[PDB]
């Protein structure tokens, strides 16, 4: 068995416990979950209007999942260096170790400062994620379905940029499942598609098209952390890693 230990061959004298730095730094670290609650970058984008968006329109959408979005290096023309360089990040890295999770997520989106416009945010649990592809931010365009617009019944909240340009969301767990998949999701069962993301967050400005131009190419960082209630389940060993300092230099 994996954890069996046939025969210890101790040489060590007892070593004093640090209590995980509690002895020194005054704080324990053994509880990985509390570390999990520190926020992490979740995504990044420049706003990019396409159609003359109506106020109804969501500016963009994304699946809301612990695993982290499929990593975005960005284009060769426009690398997102932080993923290009600072690969992945902690929370997904630990997510690598488990096959299931149940619980919530925090986000705390940061809007560009320069704009004043009021900002709404839908949550749509209804949406199924579909394939690990498109586990990512998406810029909605011309309205067709109700997907591209603000929607009624879905829970939502509206930050006022003029008051403040950073919303602090909390995403409830809502699935008719025991608990969701945690590794990268290839899909299979049509039902299985519902069984991953907590749902689908979406964001839209109330700005009219005449004003919307100011908002173009503005940065929008997103963060997240597991929101206390989160619970990973089944252990799984790690997939192979890629060393970061081993990454190539930009080269002169």
């Amino acid at each position: 068995e994996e954890s069996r230990n046939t025969t210890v061959l101790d040489t060590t004298t007892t070593l004093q416990s640090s209590g995980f730095g509690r002895a020194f730094f005054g704080e324990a670290f053994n509880d990985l979950k509390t570390l999990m609650r520190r926020y992490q970058l979740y995504g990044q984008l420049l706003l990019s209007v396409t159609t003359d968006k109506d106020i109804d329109h969501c500016m963009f959408t994304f699946p809301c999942l612990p695993q982290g979005l499929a990593l975005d290096i960005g284009s060769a023309g426009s690398p997102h260096e932080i993923f290009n360089r600072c690969r992945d990040g902690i929370i997904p890295l630990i997510a690598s170790g488990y096959r299931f999770y149940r619980g919530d997520l925090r986000y705390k989106i940061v809007f560009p400062s320069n704009v004043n416009s009021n900002i709404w945010v839908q949550h749509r649990p209804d949406r199924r994620l579909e394939g690990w592809s498109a586990a990512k931010i998406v810029n909605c365009d011309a309205v067709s379905t109700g997907q591209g617009v603000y929607n009624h019944g879905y829970a939502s909240h509206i930050q006022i940029t003029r008051v403040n340009n950073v919303i602090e969301l909390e995403v409830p767990f809502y699935n008719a499942t025991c608990y969701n998949y945690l590794q990268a999701f290839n899909a299979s069962s049509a039902a299985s598609s519902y069984a991953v993301s907590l749902g689908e967050i979406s964001v839209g400005f109330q700005a009219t098209s005449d004003d919307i131009a100011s908002i173009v190419n503005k940065p929008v960082t997103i963060y997240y952390s597991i929101g206390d209630g989160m619970q990973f389940s089944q252990w799984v060993g790690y997939q192979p890693m890629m060393i970061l300092d081993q990454l190539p230099a930009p080269v002169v």
Partner: protein, 250 residues
């Protein structure tokens, strides 16, 4: 503490392992590994329908798989990746006969939904002078993870709990696999909400670790057989067997 006294009987004690009418045994002590704590029954939450285990027949052991393991097999070499609930049926279908033919598997022909823990024994008759080793590893929902192909290697599975089988001891590898899945139930057939990946739970798999090694004139190969008890199960969703369809060939 020693003093062997081999008899006509032989010598060593033999463990039993009765279930139903099936009974099977080993000389060696099983190398158990248990991925998860035992499952709660869960019928409470999702079935008005009559719900019943058929332990009298479902609990019988049955030979889902068997194969040679020659020395020729390279270090990190899978010998099998058994999606389990599927392979119990897929194997019978591989015998080219109906699921109804085997007493273990008839209810699936009828019931739509199913839940329940599995048991897997992996017996072997490697000769003592033969040397090698196989790890066995259950992996939930394996199919759902697209990156699994990367992980699917002994280094990978080694990190999670796993049974071991020395060729030398010809050790048996017992293996509890309590039910866990995103949904509480596995359909036995195509279902309005899903079809694909029917009756999957992920797969057991047996990457070779140490390849057989021996005197060149020694017994070149080895054999392995796998049985699967299906204990604290529950069936539900009564239906005509006509709705039931053959498992994907895999």
């Amino acid at each position: 503490m020693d003093n062997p006294n081999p008899g006509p009987d032989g010598e060593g004690e033999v463990e039993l392992e009765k279930d139903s009418n099936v009974v099977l045994t080993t000389q060696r002590d099983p190398s158990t590994s248990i991925p998860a704590p035992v499952s709660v029954k869960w019928s409470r939450w999702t079935s008005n329908d009559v719900v019943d285990d058929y332990a009298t027949i479902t609990s019988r052991w049955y030979q889902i798989a068997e194969f040679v393991w020659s020395k020729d097999d390279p270090f990190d070499k899978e010998l099998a990746r058994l999606i389990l609930p599927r392979a119990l049926l897929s194997s019978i279908e591989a015998n080219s006969d109906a699921i109804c033919d085997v007493p273990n598997t008839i209810p699936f022909k009828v019931h739509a939904y199913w839940r329940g823990d599995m048991e897997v024994r992996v017996q072997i008759n490697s000769n003592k002078f033969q040397v090698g080793q196989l790890q066995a590893t259950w992996y939930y929902s394996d199919h759902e993870n697209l990156n699994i192909s990367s992980k699917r290697s002994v280094y990978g599975f080694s990190q999670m709990d796993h049974a071991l089988i020395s060729a030398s001891a010809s050790n048996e590898a017992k293996l509890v696999i309590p039910f866990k899945h995103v949904y509480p139930f596995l359909p036995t057939r195509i279902v309005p909400d899903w079809t694909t990946g029917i009756l999957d739970m992920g797969a057991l798999n047996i990457r070779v670790i140490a390849p057989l090694r021996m005197s060149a004139t020694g017994p070149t190969t080895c054999n392995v057989v796998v049985f699967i008890k299906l204990n604290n199960s529950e069936f539900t969703g009564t239906s005509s067997g006509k709705f039931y369809a053959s498992q994907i060939r895999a």
